[PDB]
Amino acid sequence: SMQINLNSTDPVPSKTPFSVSDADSYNKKGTVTVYDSQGNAHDMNVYFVK
Amino acid sequence: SMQINLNSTDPVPSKTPFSVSDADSYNKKGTVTVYDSQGNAHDMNVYFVK
């Protein structure tokens, strides 16, 4: 679960389309660490774009 | 609510009707910041013209 709050007046990103390398291509980046069957950590990166 | 003081000696502007850009076209300008449902800041300009 990821509870987030977003500012309504944030502008739409100018850099289309979404790119992992380009930070300006997304509004927000977050990270949540999940675990698999053998316990190895996967750093799920979640990108929010308007 | 808006509590303002109005002076009886203020003349009627010569450049009728009211013009937002023309300073001589209005007698008093005030600004009130309100919030909509999502809470964005809206600057209502209230103009008192005799």
Side-chain angles (χ1 to χ4, degrees), chain A residues 11-30 45-50:
Chain A
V12 199
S14 59
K15 173 46 175 62
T16 54
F18 145 67
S19 165
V20 285
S21 316
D22 291 0
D24 58 358
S25 77
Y26 54 73
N27 296 86
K28 179 45 161 313
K29 173 185 172 170
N45 288 193
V46 193
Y47 299 85
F48 293 60
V49 317
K50 241 197 106 177

PDB file of all heavy atoms in Angstrom, chain A residues 11-30 45-50:
ATOM      1  N   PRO A  11       2.015  21.522 -12.634  1.00  0.00           N
ATOM      2  CA  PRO A  11       1.822  21.498 -14.086  1.00  0.00           C
ATOM      3  C   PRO A  11       2.117  20.129 -14.679  1.00  0.00           C
ATOM      4  O   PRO A  11       2.847  19.317 -14.106  1.00  0.00           O
ATOM      5  CB  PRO A  11       2.819  22.546 -14.589  1.00  0.00           C
ATOM      6  CG  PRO A  11       3.920  22.504 -13.580  1.00  0.00           C
ATOM      7  CD  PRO A  11       3.260  22.212 -12.251  1.00  0.00           C
ATOM      8  N   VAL A  12       1.529  19.883 -15.845  1.00  0.00           N
ATOM      9  CA  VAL A  12       1.783  18.667 -16.615  1.00  0.00           C
ATOM     10  C   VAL A  12       3.237  18.695 -17.071  1.00  0.00           C
ATOM     11  O   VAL A  12       3.726  19.753 -17.493  1.00  0.00           O
ATOM     12  CB  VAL A  12       0.818  18.554 -17.806  1.00  0.00           C
ATOM     13  CG1 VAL A  12       0.753  17.122 -18.318  1.00  0.00           C
ATOM     14  CG2 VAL A  12      -0.566  19.049 -17.417  1.00  0.00           C
ATOM     15  N   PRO A  13       3.967  17.583 -16.990  1.00  0.00           N
ATOM     16  CA  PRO A  13       5.373  17.590 -17.414  1.00  0.00           C
ATOM     17  C   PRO A  13       5.519  17.975 -18.879  1.00  0.00           C
ATOM     18  O   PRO A  13       4.725  17.572 -19.733  1.00  0.00           O
ATOM     19  CB  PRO A  13       5.822  16.147 -17.163  1.00  0.00           C
ATOM     20  CG  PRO A  13       4.915  15.662 -16.093  1.00  0.00           C
ATOM     21  CD  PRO A  13       3.586  16.288 -16.401  1.00  0.00           C
ATOM     22  N   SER A  14       6.551  18.769 -19.165  1.00  0.00           N
ATOM     23  CA  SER A  14       6.824  19.183 -20.538  1.00  0.00           C
ATOM     24  C   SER A  14       7.487  18.065 -21.333  1.00  0.00           C
ATOM     25  O   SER A  14       7.281  17.948 -22.546  1.00  0.00           O
ATOM     26  CB  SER A  14       7.695  20.441 -20.543  1.00  0.00           C
ATOM     27  OG  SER A  14       8.919  20.217 -19.866  1.00  0.00           O
ATOM     28  N   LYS A  15       8.291  17.236 -20.667  1.00  0.00           N
ATOM     29  CA  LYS A  15       9.039  16.188 -21.348  1.00  0.00           C
ATOM     30  C   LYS A  15       8.164  14.962 -21.585  1.00  0.00           C
ATOM     31  O   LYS A  15       8.018  14.111 -20.702  1.00  0.00           O
ATOM     32  CB  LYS A  15      10.288  15.815 -20.542  1.00  0.00           C
ATOM     33  CG  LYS A  15      11.070  14.619 -21.076  1.00  0.00           C
ATOM     34  CD  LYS A  15      11.275  14.698 -22.584  1.00  0.00           C
ATOM     35  CE  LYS A  15      12.162  13.569 -23.075  1.00  0.00           C
ATOM     36  NZ  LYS A  15      11.545  12.237 -22.815  1.00  0.00           N
ATOM     37  N   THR A  16       7.559  14.879 -22.768  1.00  0.00           N
ATOM     38  CA  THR A  16       6.835  13.678 -23.148  1.00  0.00           C
ATOM     39  C   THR A  16       7.712  12.797 -24.038  1.00  0.00           C
ATOM     40  O   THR A  16       8.480  13.301 -24.861  1.00  0.00           O
ATOM     41  CB  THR A  16       5.546  14.036 -23.883  1.00  0.00           C
ATOM     42  OG1 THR A  16       5.846  14.901 -24.985  1.00  0.00           O
ATOM     43  CG2 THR A  16       4.577  14.738 -22.942  1.00  0.00           C
ATOM     44  N   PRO A  17       7.617  11.469 -23.893  1.00  0.00           N
ATOM     45  CA  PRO A  17       6.784  10.717 -22.950  1.00  0.00           C
ATOM     46  C   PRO A  17       7.508  10.429 -21.641  1.00  0.00           C
ATOM     47  O   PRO A  17       8.531  11.039 -21.340  1.00  0.00           O
ATOM     48  CB  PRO A  17       6.483   9.437 -23.732  1.00  0.00           C
ATOM     49  CG  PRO A  17       7.764   9.189 -24.495  1.00  0.00           C
ATOM     50  CD  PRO A  17       8.345  10.562 -24.801  1.00  0.00           C
ATOM     51  N   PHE A  18       6.986   9.503 -20.840  1.00  0.00           N
ATOM     52  CA  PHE A  18       7.636   9.137 -19.591  1.00  0.00           C
ATOM     53  C   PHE A  18       8.941   8.402 -19.873  1.00  0.00           C
ATOM     54  O   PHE A  18       8.976   7.449 -20.658  1.00  0.00           O
ATOM     55  CB  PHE A  18       6.696   8.267 -18.753  1.00  0.00           C
ATOM     56  CG  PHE A  18       7.393   7.198 -17.955  1.00  0.00           C
ATOM     57  CD1 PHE A  18       8.236   7.526 -16.903  1.00  0.00           C
ATOM     58  CD2 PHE A  18       7.207   5.862 -18.264  1.00  0.00           C
ATOM     59  CE1 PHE A  18       8.874   6.541 -16.175  1.00  0.00           C
ATOM     60  CE2 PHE A  18       7.844   4.874 -17.541  1.00  0.00           C
ATOM     61  CZ  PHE A  18       8.679   5.212 -16.494  1.00  0.00           C
ATOM     62  N   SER A  19      10.017   8.850 -19.227  1.00  0.00           N
ATOM     63  CA  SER A  19      11.334   8.242 -19.373  1.00  0.00           C
ATOM     64  C   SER A  19      11.934   8.042 -17.990  1.00  0.00           C
ATOM     65  O   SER A  19      11.876   8.946 -17.152  1.00  0.00           O
ATOM     66  CB  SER A  19      12.252   9.110 -20.238  1.00  0.00           C
ATOM     67  OG  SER A  19      13.606   8.714 -20.103  1.00  0.00           O
ATOM     68  N   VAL A  20      12.502   6.857 -17.754  1.00  0.00           N
ATOM     69  CA  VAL A  20      13.107   6.569 -16.456  1.00  0.00           C
ATOM     70  C   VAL A  20      14.341   7.437 -16.235  1.00  0.00           C
ATOM     71  O   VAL A  20      14.591   7.912 -15.120  1.00  0.00           O
ATOM     72  CB  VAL A  20      13.440   5.069 -16.339  1.00  0.00           C
ATOM     73  CG1 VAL A  20      12.172   4.265 -16.097  1.00  0.00           C
ATOM     74  CG2 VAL A  20      14.146   4.578 -17.593  1.00  0.00           C
ATOM     75  N   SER A  21      15.130   7.657 -17.288  1.00  0.00           N
ATOM     76  CA  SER A  21      16.359   8.432 -17.148  1.00  0.00           C
ATOM     77  C   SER A  21      16.060   9.909 -16.917  1.00  0.00           C
ATOM     78  O   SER A  21      16.721  10.568 -16.104  1.00  0.00           O
ATOM     79  CB  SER A  21      17.237   8.246 -18.386  1.00  0.00           C
ATOM     80  OG  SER A  21      17.277   6.886 -18.782  1.00  0.00           O
ATOM     81  N   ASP A  22      15.068  10.448 -17.621  1.00  0.00           N
ATOM     82  CA  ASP A  22      14.750  11.872 -17.558  1.00  0.00           C
ATOM     83  C   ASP A  22      13.850  12.130 -16.355  1.00  0.00           C
ATOM     84  O   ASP A  22      12.722  11.632 -16.295  1.00  0.00           O
ATOM     85  CB  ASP A  22      14.088  12.332 -18.853  1.00  0.00           C
ATOM     86  CG  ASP A  22      15.045  12.328 -20.028  1.00  0.00           C
ATOM     87  OD1 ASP A  22      16.224  11.967 -19.832  1.00  0.00           O
ATOM     88  OD2 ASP A  22      14.620  12.690 -21.145  1.00  0.00           O
ATOM     89  N   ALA A  23      14.354  12.912 -15.398  1.00  0.00           N
ATOM     90  CA  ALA A  23      13.575  13.216 -14.201  1.00  0.00           C
ATOM     91  C   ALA A  23      12.418  14.157 -14.514  1.00  0.00           C
ATOM     92  O   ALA A  23      11.356  14.078 -13.885  1.00  0.00           O
ATOM     93  CB  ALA A  23      14.479  13.815 -13.125  1.00  0.00           C
ATOM     94  N   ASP A  24      12.603  15.056 -15.481  1.00  0.00           N
ATOM     95  CA  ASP A  24      11.578  16.039 -15.815  1.00  0.00           C
ATOM     96  C   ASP A  24      10.403  15.397 -16.542  1.00  0.00           C
ATOM     97  O   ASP A  24       9.367  16.037 -16.746  1.00  0.00           O
ATOM     98  CB  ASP A  24      12.175  17.171 -16.657  1.00  0.00           C
ATOM     99  CG  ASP A  24      12.813  16.673 -17.944  1.00  0.00           C
ATOM    100  OD1 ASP A  24      12.839  15.447 -18.173  1.00  0.00           O
ATOM    101  OD2 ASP A  24      13.289  17.519 -18.732  1.00  0.00           O
ATOM    102  N   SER A  25      10.553  14.134 -16.938  1.00  0.00           N
ATOM    103  CA  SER A  25       9.502  13.400 -17.627  1.00  0.00           C
ATOM    104  C   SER A  25       8.416  12.894 -16.687  1.00  0.00           C
ATOM    105  O   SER A  25       7.361  12.461 -17.159  1.00  0.00           O
ATOM    106  CB  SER A  25      10.103  12.221 -18.401  1.00  0.00           C
ATOM    107  OG  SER A  25      10.425  11.151 -17.530  1.00  0.00           O
ATOM    108  N   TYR A  26       8.644  12.938 -15.377  1.00  0.00           N
ATOM    109  CA  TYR A  26       7.665  12.478 -14.406  1.00  0.00           C
ATOM    110  C   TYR A  26       7.549  13.501 -13.284  1.00  0.00           C
ATOM    111  O   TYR A  26       8.497  14.229 -12.982  1.00  0.00           O
ATOM    112  CB  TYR A  26       8.034  11.089 -13.854  1.00  0.00           C
ATOM    113  CG  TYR A  26       9.434  10.975 -13.281  1.00  0.00           C
ATOM    114  CD1 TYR A  26       9.766  11.561 -12.065  1.00  0.00           C
ATOM    115  CD2 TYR A  26      10.427  10.286 -13.965  1.00  0.00           C
ATOM    116  CE1 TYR A  26      11.041  11.458 -11.545  1.00  0.00           C
ATOM    117  CE2 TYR A  26      11.706  10.179 -13.451  1.00  0.00           C
ATOM    118  CZ  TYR A  26      12.007  10.767 -12.241  1.00  0.00           C
ATOM    119  OH  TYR A  26      13.279  10.665 -11.726  1.00  0.00           O
ATOM    120  N   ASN A  27       6.366  13.554 -12.673  1.00  0.00           N
ATOM    121  CA  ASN A  27       6.143  14.461 -11.555  1.00  0.00           C
ATOM    122  C   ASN A  27       6.784  13.982 -10.261  1.00  0.00           C
ATOM    123  O   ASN A  27       7.369  14.795  -9.535  1.00  0.00           O
ATOM    124  CB  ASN A  27       4.645  14.674 -11.320  1.00  0.00           C
ATOM    125  CG  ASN A  27       3.961  15.363 -12.482  1.00  0.00           C
ATOM    126  OD1 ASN A  27       3.538  14.719 -13.438  1.00  0.00           O
ATOM    127  ND2 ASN A  27       3.846  16.684 -12.401  1.00  0.00           N
ATOM    128  N   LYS A  28       6.692  12.691  -9.947  1.00  0.00           N
ATOM    129  CA  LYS A  28       7.150  12.220  -8.648  1.00  0.00           C
ATOM    130  C   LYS A  28       7.732  10.823  -8.803  1.00  0.00           C
ATOM    131  O   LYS A  28       7.250  10.033  -9.617  1.00  0.00           O
ATOM    132  CB  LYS A  28       5.991  12.212  -7.639  1.00  0.00           C
ATOM    133  CG  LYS A  28       6.338  11.715  -6.244  1.00  0.00           C
ATOM    134  CD  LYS A  28       7.652  12.318  -5.762  1.00  0.00           C
ATOM    135  CE  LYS A  28       7.786  12.229  -4.259  1.00  0.00           C
ATOM    136  NZ  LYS A  28       6.545  12.678  -3.572  1.00  0.00           N
ATOM    137  N   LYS A  29       8.767  10.525  -8.023  1.00  0.00           N
ATOM    138  CA  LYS A  29       9.353   9.195  -7.959  1.00  0.00           C
ATOM    139  C   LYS A  29       9.388   8.710  -6.516  1.00  0.00           C
ATOM    140  O   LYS A  29       9.830   9.434  -5.618  1.00  0.00           O
ATOM    141  CB  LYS A  29      10.767   9.184  -8.543  1.00  0.00           C
ATOM    142  CG  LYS A  29      11.494   7.865  -8.354  1.00  0.00           C
ATOM    143  CD  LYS A  29      12.932   7.955  -8.831  1.00  0.00           C
ATOM    144  CE  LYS A  29      13.714   6.705  -8.469  1.00  0.00           C
ATOM    145  NZ  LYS A  29      15.048   6.680  -9.127  1.00  0.00           N
ATOM    146  N   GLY A  30       8.916   7.478  -6.297  1.00  0.00           N
ATOM    147  CA  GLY A  30       8.977   6.860  -4.992  1.00  0.00           C
ATOM    148  C   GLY A  30       9.522   5.447  -5.094  1.00  0.00           C
ATOM    149  O   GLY A  30       9.587   4.861  -6.176  1.00  0.00           O
ATOM    150  N   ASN A  45      10.298   0.894  -8.038  1.00  0.00           N
ATOM    151  CA  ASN A  45      10.226   2.331  -8.253  1.00  0.00           C
ATOM    152  C   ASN A  45       8.920   2.689  -8.945  1.00  0.00           C
ATOM    153  O   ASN A  45       8.608   2.170 -10.023  1.00  0.00           O
ATOM    154  CB  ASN A  45      11.417   2.821  -9.076  1.00  0.00           C
ATOM    155  CG  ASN A  45      12.719   2.804  -8.299  1.00  0.00           C
ATOM    156  OD1 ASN A  45      13.712   3.388  -8.731  1.00  0.00           O
ATOM    157  ND2 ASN A  45      12.715   2.166  -7.134  1.00  0.00           N
ATOM    158  N   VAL A  46       8.168   3.596  -8.331  1.00  0.00           N
ATOM    159  CA  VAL A  46       6.846   3.991  -8.795  1.00  0.00           C
ATOM    160  C   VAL A  46       6.926   5.446  -9.232  1.00  0.00           C
ATOM    161  O   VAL A  46       7.361   6.310  -8.460  1.00  0.00           O
ATOM    162  CB  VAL A  46       5.782   3.800  -7.706  1.00  0.00           C
ATOM    163  CG1 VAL A  46       4.389   3.919  -8.300  1.00  0.00           C
ATOM    164  CG2 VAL A  46       5.967   2.460  -7.009  1.00  0.00           C
ATOM    165  N   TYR A  47       6.506   5.713 -10.463  1.00  0.00           N
ATOM    166  CA  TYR A  47       6.570   7.042 -11.050  1.00  0.00           C
ATOM    167  C   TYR A  47       5.159   7.577 -11.239  1.00  0.00           C
ATOM    168  O   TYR A  47       4.298   6.887 -11.793  1.00  0.00           O
ATOM    169  CB  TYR A  47       7.314   7.012 -12.386  1.00  0.00           C
ATOM    170  CG  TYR A  47       8.744   6.533 -12.275  1.00  0.00           C
ATOM    171  CD1 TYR A  47       9.046   5.177 -12.289  1.00  0.00           C
ATOM    172  CD2 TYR A  47       9.790   7.436 -12.154  1.00  0.00           C
ATOM    173  CE1 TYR A  47      10.350   4.736 -12.185  1.00  0.00           C
ATOM    174  CE2 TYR A  47      11.097   7.003 -12.051  1.00  0.00           C
ATOM    175  CZ  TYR A  47      11.370   5.653 -12.068  1.00  0.00           C
ATOM    176  OH  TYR A  47      12.671   5.218 -11.964  1.00  0.00           O
ATOM    177  N   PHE A  48       4.933   8.805 -10.783  1.00  0.00           N
ATOM    178  CA  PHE A  48       3.658   9.492 -10.917  1.00  0.00           C
ATOM    179  C   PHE A  48       3.835  10.623 -11.920  1.00  0.00           C
ATOM    180  O   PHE A  48       4.704  11.485 -11.740  1.00  0.00           O
ATOM    181  CB  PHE A  48       3.171  10.053  -9.577  1.00  0.00           C
ATOM    182  CG  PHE A  48       2.812   9.004  -8.557  1.00  0.00           C
ATOM    183  CD1 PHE A  48       3.753   8.093  -8.105  1.00  0.00           C
ATOM    184  CD2 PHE A  48       1.528   8.940  -8.041  1.00  0.00           C
ATOM    185  CE1 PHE A  48       3.418   7.138  -7.165  1.00  0.00           C
ATOM    186  CE2 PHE A  48       1.187   7.987  -7.102  1.00  0.00           C
ATOM    187  CZ  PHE A  48       2.134   7.084  -6.664  1.00  0.00           C
ATOM    188  N   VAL A  49       3.018  10.612 -12.971  1.00  0.00           N
ATOM    189  CA  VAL A  49       2.992  11.670 -13.976  1.00  0.00           C
ATOM    190  C   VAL A  49       1.553  12.155 -14.066  1.00  0.00           C
ATOM    191  O   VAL A  49       0.615  11.376 -13.864  1.00  0.00           O
ATOM    192  CB  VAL A  49       3.511  11.201 -15.346  1.00  0.00           C
ATOM    193  CG1 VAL A  49       4.758  10.344 -15.191  1.00  0.00           C
ATOM    194  CG2 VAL A  49       2.435  10.449 -16.116  1.00  0.00           C
ATOM    195  N   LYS A  50       1.371  13.451 -14.284  1.00  0.00           N
ATOM    196  CA  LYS A  50       0.037  13.968 -14.555  1.00  0.00           C
ATOM    197  C   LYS A  50      -0.304  13.767 -16.026  1.00  0.00           C
ATOM    198  O   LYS A  50       0.481  14.130 -16.908  1.00  0.00           O
ATOM    199  CB  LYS A  50      -0.043  15.445 -14.181  1.00  0.00           C
ATOM    200  CG  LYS A  50      -1.053  15.758 -13.095  1.00  0.00           C
ATOM    201  CD  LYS A  50      -1.381  17.238 -13.075  1.00  0.00           C
ATOM    202  CE  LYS A  50      -2.759  17.493 -13.645  1.00  0.00           C
ATOM    203  NZ  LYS A  50      -3.125  18.931 -13.580  1.00  0.00           N
TER     204      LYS A  50
END
